Short mmCIF file of all heavy atoms in Angstrom, two decimals:
data_model
loop_
_atom_site.label_atom_id
_atom_site.label_comp_id
_atom_site.label_asym_id
_atom_site.label_seq_id
_atom_site.Cartn_x
_atom_site.Cartn_y
_atom_site.Cartn_z
N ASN A 184 56.95 46.29 407.27
CA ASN A 184 56.11 46.17 408.46
C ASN A 184 55.37 47.48 408.71
O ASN A 184 55.92 48.42 409.31
CB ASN A 184 56.89 45.76 409.69
CG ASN A 184 56.08 45.78 410.97
OD1 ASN A 184 54.93 45.30 411.00
ND2 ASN A 184 56.66 46.26 412.06
N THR A 186 52.22 47.55 410.16
CA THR A 186 51.14 47.24 411.07
C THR A 186 50.77 48.45 411.97
O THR A 186 51.69 49.04 412.59
CB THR A 186 51.43 46.01 411.98
OG1 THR A 186 52.78 46.09 412.45
CG2 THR A 186 51.25 44.71 411.19
N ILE A 228 60.64 53.48 408.96
CA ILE A 228 59.42 54.25 408.84
C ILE A 228 59.34 55.23 410.03
O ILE A 228 59.55 54.84 411.16
CB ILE A 228 58.15 53.41 408.76
CG1 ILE A 228 58.17 52.59 407.44
CG2 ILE A 228 56.87 54.24 408.82
CD1 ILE A 228 57.03 51.59 407.32
N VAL A 229 59.12 56.52 409.76
CA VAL A 229 59.20 57.53 410.76
C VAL A 229 57.90 58.34 410.87
O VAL A 229 57.23 58.56 409.84
CB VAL A 229 60.36 58.52 410.49
CG1 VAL A 229 60.33 59.69 411.41
CG2 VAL A 229 61.68 57.79 410.63
C1 LIG E 401 55.81 46.22 413.20
O1 LIG E 401 55.40 47.52 413.61
C2 LIG E 401 54.91 47.62 414.93
C3 LIG E 401 54.29 48.99 415.27
O2 LIG E 401 54.46 50.03 414.31
C4 LIG E 401 55.85 50.41 414.04
O3 LIG E 401 56.00 51.06 412.82
C5 LIG E 401 57.37 51.58 412.48
C6 LIG E 401 57.25 53.06 412.30
C7 LIG E 401 58.53 51.11 413.48
O4 LIG E 401 59.66 51.96 413.33
C8 LIG E 401 58.06 51.05 414.98
O5 LIG E 401 58.81 52.00 415.69
C9 LIG E 401 56.58 51.23 415.15
O6 LIG E 401 56.14 50.94 416.49
C10 LIG E 401 56.01 47.20 415.93
O7 LIG E 401 55.55 47.29 417.24
C11 LIG E 401 56.42 48.03 418.10
O8 LIG E 401 57.18 47.18 418.93
C12 LIG E 401 56.54 46.45 419.94
C13 LIG E 401 56.20 45.02 419.41
O9 LIG E 401 55.92 44.21 420.53
C14 LIG E 401 55.27 47.09 420.57
O10 LIG E 401 55.61 47.73 421.77
C15 LIG E 401 54.57 48.09 419.65
O11 LIG E 401 53.78 47.41 418.72
C16 LIG E 401 55.58 48.99 418.98
N1 LIG E 401 56.46 49.68 419.91
C17 LIG E 401 56.08 50.56 420.85
C18 LIG E 401 57.16 51.37 421.48
O12 LIG E 401 54.92 50.75 421.19
C19 LIG E 401 56.45 45.78 415.63
O13 LIG E 401 57.62 45.47 416.44
C20 LIG E 401 56.79 45.56 414.16
N2 LIG E 401 56.88 44.13 413.87
C21 LIG E 401 57.98 43.59 413.45
C22 LIG E 401 57.90 42.74 412.21
O14 LIG E 401 59.05 43.69 414.06
#
Side-chain angles (χ1 to χ4, degrees):
Chain A
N184 174 44
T186 43
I228 293 174
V229 171

